[PDB]
Design a protein around this motif. Sequence first.
Motif, PDB file in Angstrom:
ATOM      1  N   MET A 321     -33.922 -14.681  22.892  1.00 53.02           N
ATOM      2  CA  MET A 321     -33.728 -15.748  23.392  1.00 53.02           C
ATOM      3  C   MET A 321     -32.753 -16.435  23.158  1.00 53.02           C
ATOM      4  SD  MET A 321     -36.900 -17.764  23.555  1.00 53.02           S
ATOM      5  CE  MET A 321     -36.726 -17.006  25.211  1.00 53.02           C
ATOM      6  N   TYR A 322     -31.639 -16.090  22.131  1.00 50.18           N
ATOM      7  CA  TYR A 322     -30.231 -16.314  21.749  1.00 50.18           C
ATOM      8  C   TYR A 322     -29.342 -15.778  22.706  1.00 50.18           C
ATOM      9  CZ  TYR A 322     -29.516 -18.965  17.273  1.00 50.18           C
ATOM     10  OH  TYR A 322     -29.496 -20.049  16.384  1.00 50.18           O
ATOM     11  N   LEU A 323     -29.690 -14.477  23.036  1.00 49.20           N
ATOM     12  CA  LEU A 323     -29.039 -13.849  24.017  1.00 49.20           C
ATOM     13  C   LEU A 323     -29.196 -13.982  25.350  1.00 49.20           C
ATOM     14  CD1 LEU A 323     -27.002 -11.530  24.424  1.00 49.20           C
ATOM     15  CD2 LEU A 323     -28.845  -9.954  23.884  1.00 49.20           C
ATOM     16  N   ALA A 324     -30.421 -14.398  25.774  1.00 48.45           N
ATOM     17  CA  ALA A 324     -30.658 -14.783  26.930  1.00 48.45           C
ATOM     18  C   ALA A 324     -30.045 -16.123  27.405  1.00 48.45           C
ATOM     19  CB  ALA A 324     -32.286 -14.990  26.895  1.00 48.45           C
ATOM     20  N   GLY A 325     -30.062 -16.989  26.481  1.00 46.01           N
ATOM     21  CA  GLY A 325     -29.138 -17.959  26.724  1.00 46.01           C
ATOM     22  C   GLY A 325     -28.025 -17.844  27.242  1.00 46.01           C
ATOM     23  N   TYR A 326     -27.179 -16.995  26.315  1.00 46.25           N
ATOM     24  CA  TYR A 326     -25.881 -16.664  26.497  1.00 46.25           C
ATOM     25  C   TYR A 326     -25.534 -16.558  28.192  1.00 46.25           C
ATOM     26  CZ  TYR A 326     -21.199 -14.581  26.159  1.00 46.25           C
ATOM     27  OH  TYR A 326     -19.962 -14.270  26.521  1.00 46.25           O
ATOM     28  N   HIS A 327     -26.283 -15.650  28.671  1.00 47.93           N
ATOM     29  CA  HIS A 327     -26.188 -14.902  29.758  1.00 47.93           C
ATOM     30  C   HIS A 327     -26.626 -16.278  31.044  1.00 47.93           C
ATOM     31  CE1 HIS A 327     -25.263 -11.321  28.663  1.00 47.93           C
ATOM     32  NE2 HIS A 327     -26.420 -10.658  28.236  1.00 47.93           N
ATOM     33  N   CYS A 328     -27.740 -16.600  30.689  1.00 49.57           N
ATOM     34  CA  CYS A 328     -28.243 -17.906  31.563  1.00 49.57           C
ATOM     35  C   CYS A 328     -27.138 -19.052  31.814  1.00 49.57           C
ATOM     36  CB  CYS A 328     -29.424 -18.560  31.185  1.00 49.57           C
ATOM     37  SG  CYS A 328     -30.062 -19.979  31.746  1.00 49.57           S
ATOM     38  N   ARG A 329     -26.495 -19.478  30.445  1.00 50.63           N
ATOM     39  CA  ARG A 329     -25.289 -20.307  30.499  1.00 50.63           C
ATOM     40  C   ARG A 329     -24.166 -19.852  31.333  1.00 50.63           C
ATOM     41  NH1 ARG A 329     -27.279 -20.595  25.153  1.00 50.63           N
ATOM     42  NH2 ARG A 329     -25.346 -19.218  24.651  1.00 50.63           N
ATOM     43  N   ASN A 330     -23.929 -18.565  31.148  1.00 47.91           N
ATOM     44  CA  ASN A 330     -22.738 -17.841  31.800  1.00 47.91           C
ATOM     45  C   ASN A 330     -23.155 -17.077  33.031  1.00 47.91           C
ATOM     46  OD1 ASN A 330     -20.268 -17.903  30.458  1.00 47.91           O
ATOM     47  ND2 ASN A 330     -21.113 -17.048  28.429  1.00 47.91           N
ATOM     48  N   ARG A 331     -23.992 -17.894  33.825  1.00 48.50           N
ATOM     49  CA  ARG A 331     -24.857 -17.292  35.039  1.00 48.50           C
ATOM     50  C   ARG A 331     -24.616 -15.646  35.161  1.00 48.50           C
ATOM     51  NH1 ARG A 331     -22.006 -22.384  38.521  1.00 48.50           N
ATOM     52  NH2 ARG A 331     -23.206 -23.963  37.518  1.00 48.50           N
ATOM     53  N   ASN A 332     -25.494 -15.106  34.347  1.00 48.57           N
ATOM     54  CA  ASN A 332     -25.616 -13.836  34.565  1.00 48.57           C
ATOM     55  C   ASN A 332     -27.008 -13.266  34.229  1.00 48.57           C
ATOM     56  OD1 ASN A 332     -22.694 -13.403  34.315  1.00 48.57           O
ATOM     57  ND2 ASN A 332     -22.907 -12.889  32.000  1.00 48.57           N
ATOM     58  N   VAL A 333     -27.604 -13.817  35.657  1.00 51.38           N
ATOM     59  CA  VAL A 333     -29.150 -13.492  35.940  1.00 51.38           C
ATOM     60  C   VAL A 333     -29.718 -12.027  35.420  1.00 51.38           C
ATOM     61  CG1 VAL A 333     -29.654 -15.182  37.605  1.00 51.38           C
ATOM     62  CG2 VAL A 333     -28.286 -13.170  38.061  1.00 51.38           C
ATOM     63  N   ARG A 334     -29.238 -11.249  35.980  1.00 50.90           N
ATOM     64  CA  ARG A 334     -29.666  -9.741  35.674  1.00 50.90           C
ATOM     65  C   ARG A 334     -29.956  -9.499  34.093  1.00 50.90           C
ATOM     66  NH1 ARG A 334     -26.379  -5.453  39.380  1.00 50.90           N
ATOM     67  NH2 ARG A 334     -27.175  -6.081  41.436  1.00 50.90           N
ATOM     68  N   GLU A 335     -28.670  -9.667  33.337  1.00 48.07           N
ATOM     69  CA  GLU A 335     -28.974  -9.631  31.776  1.00 48.07           C
ATOM     70  C   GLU A 335     -29.810 -10.684  31.123  1.00 48.07           C
ATOM     71  OE1 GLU A 335     -26.028  -9.151  33.869  1.00 48.07           O
ATOM     72  OE2 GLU A 335     -25.954  -7.094  33.301  1.00 48.07           O
ATOM     73  N   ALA A 336     -29.865 -11.833  31.712  1.00 50.51           N
ATOM     74  CA  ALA A 336     -30.808 -12.985  31.198  1.00 50.51           C
ATOM     75  C   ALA A 336     -32.117 -12.477  31.351  1.00 50.51           C
ATOM     76  CB  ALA A 336     -30.351 -14.149  32.127  1.00 50.51           C
ATOM     77  N   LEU A 337     -32.683 -12.086  32.591  1.00 48.62           N
ATOM     78  CA  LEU A 337     -33.914 -11.888  32.728  1.00 48.62           C
ATOM     79  C   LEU A 337     -34.625 -10.664  31.829  1.00 48.62           C
ATOM     80  CD1 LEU A 337     -33.106 -12.513  36.236  1.00 48.62           C
ATOM     81  CD2 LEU A 337     -35.473 -12.910  35.754  1.00 48.62           C
ATOM     82  N   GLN A 338     -33.332  -9.777  31.825  1.00 48.59           N
ATOM     83  CA  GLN A 338     -33.920  -8.659  30.738  1.00 48.59           C
ATOM     84  C   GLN A 338     -34.076  -9.079  29.479  1.00 48.59           C
ATOM     85  OE1 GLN A 338     -31.483  -5.012  31.199  1.00 48.59           O
ATOM     86  NE2 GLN A 338     -30.497  -5.002  29.342  1.00 48.59           N
ATOM     87  N   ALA A 339     -33.407  -9.971  28.878  1.00 51.50           N
ATOM     88  CA  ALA A 339     -33.616 -10.301  27.595  1.00 51.50           C
ATOM     89  C   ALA A 339     -34.762 -11.336  27.502  1.00 51.50           C
ATOM     90  CB  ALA A 339     -32.107 -11.147  27.182  1.00 51.50           C
ATOM     91  N   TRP A 340     -35.167 -11.942  28.398  1.00 54.36           N
ATOM     92  CA  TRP A 340     -36.299 -12.820  28.548  1.00 54.36           C
ATOM     93  C   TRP A 340     -37.708 -11.853  28.365  1.00 54.36           C
ATOM     94  CZ3 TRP A 340     -33.297 -16.526  32.054  1.00 54.36           C
ATOM     95  CH2 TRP A 340     -32.915 -17.726  31.208  1.00 54.36           C
ATOM     96  N   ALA A 341     -37.179 -10.706  28.995  1.00 55.57           N
ATOM     97  CA  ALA A 341     -38.349  -9.782  29.090  1.00 55.57           C
ATOM     98  C   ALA A 341     -38.630  -9.115  27.831  1.00 55.57           C
ATOM     99  CB  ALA A 341     -38.117  -8.529  30.087  1.00 55.57           C
ATOM    100  N   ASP A 342     -37.571  -8.721  27.210  1.00 49.45           N
ATOM    101  CA  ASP A 342     -37.568  -8.191  25.865  1.00 49.45           C
ATOM    102  C   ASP A 342     -38.188  -9.164  24.898  1.00 49.45           C
ATOM    103  OD1 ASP A 342     -35.875  -5.751  26.182  1.00 49.45           O
ATOM    104  OD2 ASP A 342     -34.081  -7.146  26.525  1.00 49.45           O
TER     105      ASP A 342
END
Lengths: 484, 484, 8, 8
Positions: A321-342
């Motif tokens: 969630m912490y990592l998902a956050g970072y991307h989402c805020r930093n508009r990195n959809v790919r990396e975000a959705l990955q982490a949410w999936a994890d």
Amino acid sequence: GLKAAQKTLFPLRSIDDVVRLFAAELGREEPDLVLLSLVLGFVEHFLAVNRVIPTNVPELTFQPSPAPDPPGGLTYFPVADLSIIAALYARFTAQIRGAVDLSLYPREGGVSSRELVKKVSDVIWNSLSRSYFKDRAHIQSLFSFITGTKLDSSGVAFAVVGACQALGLRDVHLALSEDHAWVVFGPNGEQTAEVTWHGKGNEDRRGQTVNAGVAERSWLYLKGSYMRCDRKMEVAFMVCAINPSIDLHTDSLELLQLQQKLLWLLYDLGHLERYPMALGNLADLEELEPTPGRPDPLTLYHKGIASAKTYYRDEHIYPYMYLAGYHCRNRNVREALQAWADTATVIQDYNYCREDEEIYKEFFEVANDVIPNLLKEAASLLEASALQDPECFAHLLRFYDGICKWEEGSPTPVLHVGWATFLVQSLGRFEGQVRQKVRIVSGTVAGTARGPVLTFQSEKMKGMKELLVATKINSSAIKLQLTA
Amino acid sequence: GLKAAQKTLFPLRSIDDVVRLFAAELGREEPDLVLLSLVLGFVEHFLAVNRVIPTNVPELTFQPSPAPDPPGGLTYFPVADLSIIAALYARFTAQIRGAVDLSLYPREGGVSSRELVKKVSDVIWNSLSRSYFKDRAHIQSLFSFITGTKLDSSGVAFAVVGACQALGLRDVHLALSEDHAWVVFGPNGEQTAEVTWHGKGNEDRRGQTVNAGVAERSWLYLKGSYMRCDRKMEVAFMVCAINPSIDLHTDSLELLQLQQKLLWLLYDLGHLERYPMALGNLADLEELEPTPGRPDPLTLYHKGIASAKTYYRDEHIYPYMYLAGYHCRNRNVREALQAWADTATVIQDYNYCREDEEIYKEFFEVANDVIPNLLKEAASLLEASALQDPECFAHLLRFYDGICKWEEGSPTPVLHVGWATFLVQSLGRFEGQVRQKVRIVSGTVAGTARGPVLTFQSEKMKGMKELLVATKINSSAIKLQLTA
Amino acid sequence: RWXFPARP
Amino acid sequence: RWXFPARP
């Protein structure tokens, strides 16, 4: 009551002077929580709670110094007179030794009775105010306990543990899951106790054991993979509990620096090693105001997930969630959705129970707001990519998979029709050209002899492997499947 | 500073003694807000904020008396020493006359300058704390302002108005919409000013006029049909601002009785006549702990809607919501859905604007939670009726109609796909046998010469008059219509 | 904690 | 106002 090797480090007149007390207290065998809490509560008070300076209290003094950015001339800091701090300390100790007498608690060689622990609990619990709101800011420290008699859910347990150190019991420790706190004691520290309430409902299981919650496979108790603290970790907790919030929109610069510094201190000493969440907190902090010569935020989120896997059977949710956050805020959809999936990958092997409402909501926000908003934003950024990557569509599916597996074997249903609309709408955000390049295989052969691929674990998500990959998304259908 | 006909009514040692001050101050031509606020703030403090009794303050005393229900022996009440109250009063007055001098504000015969009003505003505004959360409990009174420097959004305006009475300006008054507060002044009181912030965002329009918000047809400003107070109404406000909340789940008995009493007082004196919302508040209170010889709750909700229609062009939302509530809680679906429909009937002639978020959420709760829950509950009560009354199905439709009409001509879209799922699901809660007994006529002949019927006003709701009345509810379709 | 006064 | 300490 205080030792002289501590007294000498007073008084404190800057953030740095505070760090010294912590670096120094942390190098002893038995770090004083009661002392460190009080200093932290004291500082946090005049910095965040009551910033107006009293001019009629000759005992309280403040210390000027150049202000951080070009903005401003002089900043003031609350001088921590040895006298003030030692007075509070003593008052706390009096309450305790004077409300509980170890005279009748025979401890066979370094263990504490379950009656003793439940007592010290009660002592603190009955010491608590009758009139206050349990969710308010800045009532985490013992400064709060001793001054105002106000203490928040987690604060109460920390208190019980500080109280025991005061009584000399050195086998009692803080147990920390991601959303709760209780106590661990006994030889090898396998005996447990509930000492604080959880959630809005004043419902407590005080005196009862966690055994039942671990059993039911709820996330409150992390299937038994919760943190078992030691004095050094407990000091970390305290540093993590520092609330720099002056206002809903304002934050105390000095309290941020202080908490950031103290975390590094803890990091260098390696005491953050088994505390995933603290690694996250440190991460986020850095993202906003980085310090020279220190690792990137992204580096840290991972050190955090590392810790999770190593020491806690990778059974903790927040480090993703912490990592998902970072991307989402930093508009990195790919990396975000990955982490949410994890994340859902962890949640799937749990059950949604009564007290797990905090995490339910945290998925519901991702599923029904945060995600449908990165997607909405993506459907407009190409029109002026990632919305056309199959691997991202698998990430989304796998996320929903985990959430479906979670629901399985649970008391309360996770999914309801409202989850569906945003599932349907997020699918529809992906072109059929893409939703079909994803291989939804169940399994060729098992074991091993001597586009992207995706296997579903939830019976629900399996039954739809076809509807998801249609050219036309059957609204009416997906709904009636997702809920059952 | 205080008049002697007031002093004599002190000290106050019970709820009743407090009522006397109010009944007595309310029979003067210029009721003292500063005095009444302070008494109310003072009482509310030791009753709700800090209930632990100080034994080292020889100036503060408490008063014993038999406890209301069989439970308990003795209850204690905070004696309001004339000395304490008069000291606060004076301190407030000093701040004001000493921070603003009317020496340079020529008032042509009973009017106040826009510069004077904006000044008194500023005086109070700069007097405010830097460090606090603006939504916290018990910072509404001047007791709060003078003691802690904390005051909540509405509290600030009340303060500005009390300040003016202190300076002698008797043309400045409290303007009250359902979710905001500002000031009205000038001859005939048609000139207006913004004095406080609104919502989470510290965004203020201080010094600016409401004219722009009334213009844009937002609900914050009620299309100009907001309350214009007089000293007597302002005293009502104050009584309505009493927050009996000790805790998220605990309430101060004495503060409830006190607020209930003071409302009746205000009612008998007829001063509730133009205050719909106060009539509601009184209603709800009674439902829980009725008083002998007084009207029913239901009686009161209506006296409230009456007032709305009479004095405010029936343009106020809460008096329906209040009534809707009562039924919903008292499981009277028919009467509930009726009132929710009446609500949308008002909302339809507005526009959803930025600052109207409070009411948006209040419909969203009805639409997407409260209603789908009375229905869910009804589908199980017959299986062991109203779920088979067409008039109820019309109520629901008309409700959705109003909400669609609202959206029309608005900056921000009201409806999104998430509203749809609960529309579809609430329809599906009604048998096709019933959804067809409702006559959705547009219009036979107009004017007049010399099942149940339902006419839609929203183009959206019109375009679906058929889908709603099908035997099979087209999910996919209704969605794509509702949003556009 | 805090509603607008007299809210429902 | 108040999160669980170190929450995300």
